[PDB]
Structures are given as C-alpha cells and as structure tokens.
C-alpha cells in the first residue's frame with residue numbers, strides 16, 4: 001500500500017533493511033518480508049530413556065509452519081505442541097512448557113502433556129465460635145543448603161592470548177591496562193570469597209570444646 | 222519539637238487502623254535470541270562465516286536460559302509458599318470485618334479480586350499474548366509492529382510457567398488461610414479461630430490488651446473497611462502507583478527495541494546491509510565487510526545479555542525481599558519496624 | 567535450655583519437662599532421618615554442585631574459545647607466523663588479540679556477576695548463622711518450617727548446611743470458644759490463654775497445646791461489664807481465696 005515518490009526505488013525500515021521495492025517493469029510497489037519466523041522448542045526425556053521427542057512451535061496456532069505433523073497435536077497458549085498426548089489429569093510439573101502446561105514421560109510409554117497442579121484442595125472449617133487446638137506436637141528437623149564461596153581464579157593474559165610467542169607479546173604490550181584491570185577484578189573476587197567464608201563461619205572467636213560426658217538428658221548429637 | 226520533660230509522658234487515648242500498599246517486582250520477561258537470525262538473517266554466506274565464532278551464542282543463550290529459569294523460580298518462591306489450596310467459607314461473617322475487595326469475585330472469568338482487577342488493568346503489558354503468527358505479521362506490514370520486527374530479527378519472548386489465573390489462585394489460597402486460621406497454617410496444620418479472636422491475638426502481639434479490641438470491635442471493623450475502600454480509591458486515582466512494574470516492562474521492551482535499532486550500525490563497514498554488501502563485492506572483500514558486521518552485532522548481543530544479567534540480579538533481590546515479606550507479614554505477625562508497613566504491624 | 571526455647575515459642579516449660587523422653591526420641595529420630603534423606607536423594611547438594619560446575623564450565627569455555635579465528639586467516643599463532651612476514655602477520659595477530667581479550671573480558675564480567683550472587687547468598691548464610699544458630703528467631707520461615715527452636719550448622723564444600731529444629735503442632739481438636747466470660751456482672755478475659763469448652767464445661771488453655779485448666783481469678787483479668795463484648799458466655803469464675811476462708 002506504500003506510494004513511492006517518483007525519484008524513489010527502494011524503501012527501508014528502522015533497521016535499514018530493504019523492505020519495499022518498486023518493480024522496474026510494472027511500476028508497482030512490493031513489500032519484502034523474510035521467510036523465516038517463529039520460535040521452536042524441543043521437549044525430550046533423557047536419550048538414555050528414549051529417543052521420542054515433542055516439538056513446541058511457539059508462534060503457530062494449530063486450531064502449517066511445522067517440520068512434521070503427528071497423531072498428537074495439542075494447542076497451548078505457549079504454542080502448538082506436536083508429539084505429546086494431552087491428558088485431563090493434573091500432576092506436578094516435570095518438564096515445564098509454559099502457560100500452565102507441563103510435560104512428562106509416563107506409561108507402552110509416551111510423552112504426555114497436562115495442566116500443572118498447584119496443590120491439594122483444602123477447606124478450613126471456619127465458624128464464629130469454633131477453635132482448633134493441638135493436643136500433640138512433632139519435633140521436625142529440616143535442611144537448608146546455602147552456597148558461601150566460589151572458586152578463586154587468576155589469569156595470565158600473555159599466556160592465554162600470546163602463549164610463548166614473543167611477537168604476539170610485543171604486540172600485546174600496546175594494551176596492558178586492560179589485563180591489569182581484569183586481574184584487579186579477579187583479585188577482588190578472590191579476596192571476597194575468603195571474606196565470605198570468614199563472615200559465615202568465624203563468628204565466635206572462642207574455640208569451644210564439647211564435654212567428654214555426652215549426657216544431655218536423652219538428646220544425642 | 223517534642224515537649225520533653227523528666228517527669229512527663231504522653232499516652233495515646235485512641236488509635237487508627239491504617240492500611241498501606243507496598244509494590245514489589247518479582248519477575249521480568251523471559252527472552253531468547255537466535256544469533257543466526259539476528260546477525261546473518263537468511264544469508265548463507267554470513268551463516269558460514271558466523272560458524273567460525275559459533276560458541277559465543279551458546280554462551281549467550283546459556284545466560285538467557287538461566288535468567289528465564291530464574292524468573293519462574295522467583296514467582297514460585299514468592300507465591301507458592303503453601304502447597305494447600307485453602308478455600309474461603311461461603312458464609313462471610315467475620316465479626317464485621319469485610320474482605321470483599323481482596324477476596325476473589327465469582328462474577329468474573331479470571332476469578333480475581335476487585336483490587337487485583339484494578340492492578341491488572343493499570344499495568345499495560347507489551348503484548349496481548351505469546352502467539353503472534355507469521356500470517357498476521359505478513360498481513361500487517363503497514364502497521365510496522367515492534368513485536369513483528371523483534372521476531373523477524375530473532376528476538377522472542379517466552380511465556381511464564383504460571384499463568385495469572387494460577388497466581389490469583391495462590392493469592393486466594395493465602396488469603397483464605399490467613400482469614401480462617403491466623404498464622405497457624407504457615408507453621409503447620411491450619412487451625413481455625415474466629416476472626417475477632419485472631420485480631421485480639423494480634424492486638425496482644427503489639428502489646429495492647431485484648432479487651433481493647435473486644436470493646437471497640439465495631440469501630441475497628443469500620444476503620445478496617447474504610448481503609449480497604451480508600452486503598453481502591455487511591456490506587457484507581459493515582460496514575461504512577463504501579464511505576465515499578467511498568468518500569469520493568471518498559472525496560473525490557475526498550476532493550477529489545479534498542480537491539481532491533483542497532484542493526485543499522487555500519488560498524489566501520491561500507492554498509493549495514495548484508496544484501497547490499499553481497500550484491501556488489503566478491504567473497505573476499507565481502508568477507509572483510511561481513512566480518513566487521515558480525516563483530517559489531519555480536520558485541521550488541523553481548524551488551525544486551527550483560528545488562529539483562531544485571532537486571533535479573535536486581536529482580537532476584539526484589540523477589541527474595543517479596544518472598545521474605547510474604548512469609549513474615551502474611552504468614553505471621555512481624556516485630557520488625559517498618560518491614561510490614563508504617564505503624565505496629 | 568530446650569525448655570527456655572519452648573517458652574520462646576509460647577509453650578509452657580512443664581510440657582517439655584513432662585514429655586522430655588518423647589521429645590528427645592523425636593529429635594534423635596529426626597536427626598537420624600536427615601542422614602538417610604541426604605544419602606537417598608542425589609540432588610540434595612545441587613546448589614553447591616552447580617557452583618562448582620559453573621566455574622569449571624566457564625574455564626573450559628575459555629579454553630575452547632581459543633580455536634576461534636575472529637576473522638583472521640587462522641586461529642593458530644604459529645601457523646600465522648610461519649607463513650607471513652611481520653607486517654602482514656600483525657593484522658591477523660591484532661585480530662586474534664582483540665578476540666581473545668574480548669573472551670577474557672566476557673569471562674571476568676560473568677565472574678563478577680556470579681560473585682555478586684554468591685556474596686548475597688553468603689550474607690544470607692551469615693545472617694542465618696547469627697539468627698538461627700546463635701539465637702532463637704521469631705521470623706516466620708527464616709529458620710525452617712514451623713516454630714523455630716534451634717539450628718545446627720554443618721560444614722559443606724563451598725557452602726554451609728543448617729539443620730533447623732522446629733516445633734510443629736499436631737493432632738488438633740475442635741472446641742467451642744468464647745471471647746470473654748461473664749460471672750458477676752463483669753467481663754473476664756484470659757491472661758495468657760484462650761477459653762474453650764468441651765461441650766459442657768468451660769476451661770482456659772494455652773494457645774499452642776491443649777492443657778485445660780479451671781477458670782479462676784488468677785487465670786483471668788476483669789475489664790468492664792458484660793454488655794459490650796459480642797459473644798460473651800455465662801460461666802463461673804472460681805475465686806480460690808474464699809474456700810480458704
């Protein structure tokens with residue numbers, strides 16, 4: 001629908017690519033559009049488990065620009081899923097697809113697709129004069145795992161870039177400060193790792209020793 | 222100026238029940254990048270030259286995949302704290318306290334609360350969905366759609382794992398659990414208690430005897446209801462209330478559009494157009510110019526991924542703060558000053 | 567000490583002293599199950615393993631990126647220097663130098679971002695050490711699921727493991743409750759607990775463990791008359807002084 005001025009032959013977009021052209025024989029304006037379009041994801045279990053896959057076409061509404069069509073075609077809000085059988089049950093999420101849809105390899109085995117379950121349904125018996133009070137208790141022990149430090153690294157720039165080459169080293173002498181800056185950043189990281197470990201573990205400065213008699217009223221450590 | 226004296230004390234004779242809002246970003250948009258489409262779009266010569274670089278987009282896509290997984294992890298950590306979808310009772314008699322502006326509305330298909338409906342209307346996303354077909358980008362060339370330009374240059378937006386309906390379900394479960402059981406469902410089984418008795422427990426928590434609550438129950442319920450209504454009025458009136466969430470959306474859109482606009486950079490080559498270079502030059506000088514363009518566009522992608530990583534670190538800090546606030550202000554009563562609003566929580 | 571922590575989570579210490587053997591057995595059994603759980607699952611130490619794997623992958627990616635030509639005729643310094651004189655060679659060497667310097671800069675930038683994330687994790691771990699190991703925390707879910715009693719640290723490669731010991735209520739029972747009790751034209755409120763009824767008789771118990779007691783004047787306090795409290799229930803409040811007279 002573009003109307004070119006008579007001195008114009010090509011049209012360009014914001015990315016400076018030619019998206020419109022005037023045909024030189026019949027002086028009509030033609031839009032130019034790239035052929036390739038649309039995100040593609042592949043869904044697999046382990047290759048040690050099976051070689052079956054499911055392919056998600058993120059910009060295809062199957063209700064085609066697909067590689068192949070199988071017996072199982074399921075349309076999600078994350079795209080058109082091909083190769084997975086849709087079931088009506090809700091499970092926990094195994095392989096996340098997106099928009100509330102997950103995938104799994106279940107039982108004569110195939111890839112299934114389902115809506116993820118958020119949890120078990122519950123209803124509290126609320127009343128304006130009723131209370132629930134526990135009669136017992138459970139002593140529970142749970143684990144929490146937190147990273148504290150990572151590995152400290154150092155880099156020889158001349159060894160990495162110009163390994164045992166004098167001509168390369170002499171040409172690399174024109175940069176210098178960039179490698180000093182990289183090693184400054186890595187040295188800061190390396191000092192920070194030991195600081196992290198000290199701040200987590202060296203809180204108390206008295207090395208307390210446990211008593212030799214381990215009678216703690218029945219509690220055992 | 223405080224009227225200090227060595228034998229004078231000031232003691233309040235009344236109180237106001239105040240409700241205030243705190244808005245925290247939790248997740249940002251998940252993106253994926255095709256290097257071959259962005260740098261060498263439908264050019265086989267450029268693709269064969271980009272094979273010599275190769276692993277840098279594997280590194281970039283590893284970083285972007287880590288960000289995209291972290292966004293769903295952030296949303297799960299904030300909202301899926303309890304794996305028990307509690308339901309509100311059908312009889313909404315809570316001693317005069319009314320939660321209709323925060324409880325789900327069954328007359329809507331989204332099953333959102335009125336306040337949540339106002340918030341979802343007041344944050345404008347950059348897309349009405351996540352499926353933009355090739356046909357409607359081909360048939361709407363004259364509109365010059367920014368999403369169509371991004372997707373033709375290999376930039377796609379991945380949908381979140383949890384939909385807004387599932388997030389509203391988690392929020393409704395947390396609200397129902399709080400209203401019916403106090404802080405007990407965040408520590409074990411949900412133990413029911415009448416809501417005035419629960420409010421008396423909170424009053425004892427902030428150091429006020431519970432007879433104050435029981436003797437001013439109607440006034441306290443009226444103050445709570447009025448403050449909840451004023452929250453709706455203030456959010457619907459102020460246009461810059463959801464500025465943090467809108468800034469997250471705008472920053473992601475601006476970064477993708479900057480990536481699209483940077484394809485016009487010559488980077489020291491004779492042209493920024495691969496087809497214009499390949500139409501005029503033989504493969505040697507074409508290789509020189511295309512290598513310049515490849516280095517420049519790879520630098521643009523690396524800059525985008527680095528800034529996305531820094532923004533994702535900031536968003537992860539905000540999501541950790543939101544998860545901590547959910548645990549310590551929704552699932553319990555907090556003694557920490559100003560952690561859960563101004564005043565005694 | 568564990569009775570002090572029970573007092574911290576709002577349970578009277580006689581509950582602990584009367585169930586000490588059961589509490590010690592439950593604690594020993596849970597600590598014993600921790601070892602079995604960690605040995606049974608293989609993805610327990612996934613965070614520490616991902617830290618190690620990410621650092622190894624970054625170094626190996628740096629090693630593999632030396633095969634990139636970066637627009638030069640070869641990625642091999644010796645192959646360039648064997649075929650070309652120094653002026654023609656210097657262009658290719660400069661291309662390789664720019665590309666490899668970019669690779670090192672990318673590695674250092676990603677290491678800085680990862681170090682910021684690890685620093686946030688270590689600050690959280692130090693806070694958890696101070697607030698869960700060196701004290702008893704009132705913050706919900708900061709030191710495990712349930713009402714926090716105490717925590718124990720354990721050293722791990724590139725990290726720390728906390729064993730949070732919590733109190734989880736169990737075996738709840740329905741009761742009829744009331745906000746206040748009217749005895750002599752006065753409203754009576756519980757000092758520390760909650761009024762409950764088993765169907766016929768009214769008691770007062772602590773809120774986190776069922777221990778019913780006779781509603782006395784020592785158990786309650788008086789505020790006002792019986793006309794303002796919604797849901798006040800008629801029952802007798804036993805004064806212990808008057809039987810002694």
Ligand SMILES: *[C@@H]1O[C@H](CO)[C@@H](O[C@@H]2O[C@H](CO)[C@@H](O)[C@H](O)[C@H]2NC(C)=O)[C@H](O)[C@H]1NC(C)=O
Pocket residue numbers: 061062063076077350352
């Ligand atoms: C895929 O295409 C179908 C068919 O056009 C879309 O379904 C329509 O959706 C609109 C909007 O909700 C409804 O008004 C129509 O009644 C629907 N038609 C049918 C036949 O179902 C569907 O929404 C598209 N999917 C996506 C993700 O956009």
Ligand SMILES: *[C@@H]1O[C@H](CO)[C@@H](O[C@@H]2O[C@H](CO)[C@@H](O)[C@H](O)[C@H]2NC(C)=O)[C@H](O)[C@H]1NC(C)=O
Pocket residue numbers: 135136137588591592737
């Ligand atoms: C409170 O719970 C504990 C453990 O959950 C109960 O102790 C168990 O009691 C049964 C029946 O007497 C025994 O077979 C188990 O061996 C006991 N387990 C332990 C670890 O001691 C206890 O009976 C419960 N008490 C009440 C009043 O319900």
Ligand SMILES: *[C@@H]1O[C@H](CO)[C@@H](O[C@@H]2O[C@H](CO)[C@@H](O)[C@H](O)[C@H]2NC(C)=O)[C@H](O)[C@H]1NC(C)=O
Pocket residue numbers: 234235236440443444
């Ligand atoms: C404590 O404050 C409340 C609210 O500010 C007061 O309630 C108001 O009282 C006036 C005068 O009787 C009424 O006109 C208003 O309608 C009341 N507001 C509400 C929300 O009920 C209350 O009187 C104050 N009490 C004391 C002892 O000062």
Ligand SMILES: *[C@@H]1O[C@H](CO)[C@@H](O[C@@H]2O[C@H](CO)[C@@H](O)[C@H](O)[C@H]2NC(C)=O)[C@H](O)[C@H]1NC(C)=O
Pocket residue numbers: 764765766767
């Ligand atoms: C509620 O509790 C009261 C007091 O514990 C119970 O009354 C006692 O019941 C036992 C067994 O029937 C008798 O031996 C006592 O003499 C009763 N004491 C009094 C003061 O009456 C009562 O049975 C309980 N009711 C229910 C339904 O459990």
Ligand SMILES: *[C@@H]1O[C@H](CO)[C@@H](O[C@@H]2O[C@H](CO)[C@@H](O)[C@H](O)[C@H]2NC(C)=O)[C@H](O)[C@H]1NC(C)=O
Pocket residue numbers: 748800
């Ligand atoms: C609680 O006890 C009081 C006192 O016995 C009851 O008040 C009596 O109510 C009746 C009926 O209205 C009157 O005829 C009496 O004169 C009242 N007596 C006094 C001293 O006020 C009250 O009704 C009882 N409440 C319940 C719920 O049983």
Ligand SMILES: *[C@@H]1O[C@H](CO)[C@@H](O)[C@H](O)[C@H]1NC(C)=O
Pocket residue numbers: 024025026027
């Ligand atoms: C070019 O020639 C064709 C016939 O081959 C004719 O139809 C067309 O109009 C011509 N275009 C001009 C003269 O611009």
Ligand SMILES: *[C@@H]1O[C@H](CO)[C@@H](O)[C@H](O)[C@H]1NC(C)=O
Pocket residue numbers: 125132738739740
């Ligand atoms: C309390 O009563 C309700 C019914 O009103 C019931 O659903 C619930 O299981 C009861 N709680 C118990 C027995 O702990």
Ligand SMILES: *[C@@H]1O[C@H](CO)[C@@H](O)[C@H](O)[C@H]1NC(C)=O
Pocket residue numbers: 128129316796797
């Ligand atoms: C509880 O609800 C019942 C049923 O409507 C009512 O008769 C009673 O007065 C209510 N009690 C309180 C304290 O609200």
